[PDB]
Amino acid sequence: AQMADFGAAAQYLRKSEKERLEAQTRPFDIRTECFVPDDKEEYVKAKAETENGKTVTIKEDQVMQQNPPKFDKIEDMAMLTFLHEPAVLYNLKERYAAWMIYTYSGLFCVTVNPYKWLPVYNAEVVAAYRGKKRSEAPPHIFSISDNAYQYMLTDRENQSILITGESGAGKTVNTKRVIQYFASIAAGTLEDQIIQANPALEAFGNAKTVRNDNSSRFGKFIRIHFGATGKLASADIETYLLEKSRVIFQLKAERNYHIFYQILSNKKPELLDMLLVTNNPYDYAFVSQGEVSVASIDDSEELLATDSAFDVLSFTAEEKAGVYKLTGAIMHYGNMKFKQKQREEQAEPDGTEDADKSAYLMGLNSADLLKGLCHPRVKVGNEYVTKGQSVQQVYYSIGALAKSVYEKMFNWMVTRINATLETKQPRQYFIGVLDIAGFEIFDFNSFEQLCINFTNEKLQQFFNHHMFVLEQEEYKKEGIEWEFIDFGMDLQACIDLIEKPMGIMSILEEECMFPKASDMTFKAKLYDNHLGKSNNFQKPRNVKGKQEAHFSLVHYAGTVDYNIMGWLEKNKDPLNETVVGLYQKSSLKLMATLFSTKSSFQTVSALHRENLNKLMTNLKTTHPHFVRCIIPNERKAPGVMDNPLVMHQLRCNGVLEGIRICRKGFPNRILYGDFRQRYRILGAEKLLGSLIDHNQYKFGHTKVFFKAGLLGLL
């Protein structure tokens, strides 16, 4: 009735009543159809004796009784009776087979990339969601965006959109379609403007990851602004913490940010000659640690796209050649070589060719650079005194310099873009579009993975807090007396030992300052402080055949193992203020514009943690709205998803967390009339006074609440 106005798209958004009513009467049994594990599917239906094309007999408290066919295509699994892994898995499988790539999950919004053009977005014939709520329309994200509009207008409070992004595609198209929706509602457009200069971010904050080929190594938080009354204004984007350790160190079979290789494509010899640089990548260490090139992409077209982006931006000749000079100088850093002074402990240079290159490039002096690197100076009270240096300390200084150069250049380009997309009258309200990397579980986890997992941990605890308070509100609404330990914070507050200034990263910096500290000493200290005294901290199970881990933590995404080899090199950032002063005077005006505005302790962990807390404060002042994109298959074919890949994804996507938490309901909350009609075989006081446990329900204001595992009997 209310769906036929979507026409050809109604079949996708919500099927007609006929197939659904014939699907609500399927003959299925609760005691002859369960779910058992598997080697290729990991989860299969069966008939302890079990057969579905393969026979096994297993324990009777590991099977999952399949869901009732009353609910076998509902788009919101928050109403099922048997909430378990294969239930949700095959539910999504089925709703994706009979094409409906959209799904509600409690509070999330799970969508799947269809790999197929669908008119489910265009034209406005489907974008007619105007005015509606989420609960009544078919489960489209445009309804979510409309709800965000209604909320921001009716409370004058900022809103937030958090999508999972490490999926290669589905992130892009979903961002595009939602921002197009926002352009439409509160109406060379701002979307054109956004996607014009996006190659900047693509070339600076993206690199080939072992399980990807274009991964955003930073957070994109688009602020799309609205008028005081609700007409769209200009939109300023905000960037955050960046995996800047990538600047120097790269693992095997990976590489740092594209721009190096884009330039190195030997496309425009003017650059490669202005930077006095060859084309062999194996001559510059900061990029040649892993792989020098991936055959899944060409670099010439990337260089040309980036040139076009610089042109459409307000960059001049200097605002382009200077950035090229900065990148070239960072690369010429990679092969600066120093030796101990003969018979004594002091770094001495051997060959200054790269020093000449860098001094010419940045607008600096070669001798001044060399000495200020070899002779740091401090402000002691009201005096100046030089400091001696071992070679490794100077190498630390060089790496920190390169990192800071790259980071501030990145931030300045961010501000430049935010300016170039800004011309508008005074505004008040906006919607937050938070793009972020997701959880990582690779076969060899390292420090950067610990950082990203901690970020995602904070974000997941944040979401859990949100869903906790909304559920508590709903329970107060129906007079439903039920109180519980905060699901939002306490279950995860114990897995953030990493932040407590005695935990993992704290002890990490402690060792960074501790003399002669080794990874073995670090492991010793870790085991002293946490082995046995923590339940989440456990020893890894290193069985010969895999790379060795050194400790294991139980996150929400399973139990993760890490290998601590090389982490002191990852975290140390002793910044050399002398060369900072050198920068603040350079003739290369871009350098001065970067570093315009009574040190030896800076750790990547510290800055990472503080930026994370900054983003958390940025969020906690607003109201969130979540999105969960999924890549169904790796062969990119439409129609079928490979279940182990998608299952691992959904595990790390965190929706299973929402399922586990609503299991602590009463996730099933029904009215009186529906249950009175559907189960009258013999007002609800008499109907459930007939029969089970009386805590299975909580009668209040024409609402019945059910724990999972009750409607499999009805």
């Binding site: 005194v385 400091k387 001696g388 071992s390 300052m513 003399p515 302790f601």
Partner: protein, 370 residues
């Protein structure tokens, strides 16, 4: 909350915040009081000046150090200096910062007990701790093994440490330092005609010592050279004109560190006490001690002291060991740097002496447990 590091020393207060690269406040540990009359009514004359304010009104004041040989011998003056350090130089409130004080080894217990009592009662620090200057110097040098020779203004001491273990039976403490060299220079300058007797003139002579004095690699032929030519003579200009020129005094002043018989002391030179402290250690660690002689403090800042030290110890030790004198270019603040590193460690935050432990145990808490 951040903590304060307050390396006192007998000649220079160096304070700052735990976590910085260098001390924020470095001023003389001195208290001056006016001698003369005072005639201008309404000038608003203070009762006493501390720090480098007493160094600019130097001409009319009489200066006194409240620390003689690492020992605080005037507790009211030390209280004045701490009050200054907290409220006027650092500009903080001591009630909100744990304080890390520092002290030389082998000095009376009442010194530490009074430090603790003063801090907790008349400054209400939340916690405090009293480290050893040599350990912090080793922290700052970035190693866990070596025999550190600290030589400040009042006291010179060796502390041999191996793998983080101190050898307290081999600690050797000597009581000639910068101030005894300043006095010997004041006395040795009279044979050219210059007469410095005032305390202000003692400060002048200290500046002469810091600017013109060096250690001679070979004392005897250096003496003969200075006697032959006049290429070693330099000139210094007092703060009223009146240039003075000194010859062999330049290297005769710090030579006292290697021949303490010049000032009538019976001890051995710093090279020989270093060697003795080494030879008092277990035969298996002294090869690694021979190669990690860490120098610290201001009195180890003379030009050519590392070369003379290495020559002397090499002449003493067996001819197979590798003698390495480690002399950083900033060794004058090694104690403070190491103290900030220490007070910044996460594993150290349980080593503080909380106010409650003091309230339970008395001032004797300090050495009895920490």
């Amino acid at each position: 909350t951040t903590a304060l590091v307050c390396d006192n020393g007998s000649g220079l207060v160096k304070a700052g915040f735990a976590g910085d690269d260098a001390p924020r406040a470095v001023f003389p540990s001195i208290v001056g009081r006016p001698r003369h009359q005072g005639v201008m009514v309404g000038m608003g004359q203070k009762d006493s000046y501390v720090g480098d304010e007493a160094q600019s009104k130097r001409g009319i004041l009489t200066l006194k150090y409240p620390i003689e040989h690492g020992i605080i011998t005037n507790w009211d003056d030390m209280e004045k200096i701490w009050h200054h350090t907290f409220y006027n130089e650092l500009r903080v409130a001591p009630e909100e910062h744990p304080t890390l004080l520092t002290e030389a080894p082998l000095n009376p217990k009442a010194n530490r007990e009074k430090m603790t009592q003063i801090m907790f009662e008349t400054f209400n620090v939340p916690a405090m701790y009293v480290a050893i200057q040599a350990v912090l110097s080793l922290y700052a040098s970035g190693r866990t093994t070596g025999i550190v020779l600290d030589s400040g203004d009042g006291v010179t001491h060796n502390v041999p440490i191996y793998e983080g273990y101190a050898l307290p039976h081999a600690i050797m403490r000597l009581d000639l330092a910068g101030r005894d060299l300043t006095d010997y220079l004041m006395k040795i300058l009279t044979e050219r005609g210059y007469s410095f007797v005032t305390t202000a003139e003692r400060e002048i002579v200290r500046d002469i010592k810091e600017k013109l004095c060096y250690v001679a690699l070979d004392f005897e032929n250096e003496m003969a050279t200075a006697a032959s030519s006049s290429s070693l003579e330099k000139s210094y200009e007092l703060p009223d004109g009146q240039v003075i020129t000194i010859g062999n005094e330049r290297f005769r002043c710090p030579e006292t560190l290697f021949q303490p018989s010049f000032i009538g002391m019976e001890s051995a030179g710093i090279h020989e006490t270093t060697y003795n402290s080494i030879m008092k250690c277990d035969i298996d660690i002294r090869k690694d001690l021979y190669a990690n002689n860490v120098l610290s403090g201001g009195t180890t800042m003379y030009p050519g002291i590392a070369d003379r030290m290495q020559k002397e110890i090499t002449a003493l030790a067996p001819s197979t060991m590798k003698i390495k004198i480690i002399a950083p270019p900033e060794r004058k603040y090694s104690v403070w740097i190491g103290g900030s590193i220490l007070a910044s460690l996460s594993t150290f935050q349980q080593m503080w002496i909380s106010k409650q432990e003091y309230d339970e145990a008395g001032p004797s808490i300090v050495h009895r447990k920490c």
